[PDB]
């Protein structure tokens, strides 16, 4: 949304004027982050952890 602005001074019985909410967008473009590891079954058995 646009910033808050200020109402306008007006005569009596006069037309109210427009300064409605104006809009824009912020983009996102997510990047894939990856991590991998491999362990042999014999390592998995033998390790203390």
């Amino acid at each position: 949304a646009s910033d808050e602005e200020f109402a306008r001074p007006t005569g009596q019985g006069a037309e109210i004027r427009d300064d409605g909410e104006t809009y824009t967008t912020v983009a996102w473009n997510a990047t894939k982050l990856t991590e991998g590891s491999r362990v042999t079954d014999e390592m998995r058995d033998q390790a203390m952890v």
Binding site: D18, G20, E21, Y23, T24, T25
Partner: protein
């Protein structure tokens, strides 16, 4: 002006993408009606005549 869809066409909503994908060229499927269909037990075989 005011607020109309031509201004905020990517800002306040997305253009619809239809959930239905319309077909390419479809070729005429007939063989199952246009022939006798044999559900074989084996890749190679012979039919008695």
């Amino acid at each position: 002006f005011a607020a109309s869809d031509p201004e905020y066409v990517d800002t306040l909503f997305r253009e619809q993408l239809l959930e239905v994908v319309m077909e390419g060229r479809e070729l005429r499927k007939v063989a199952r009606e246009a022939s006798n269909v044999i559900n074989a037990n084996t890749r190679v075989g012979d039919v008695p005549i």
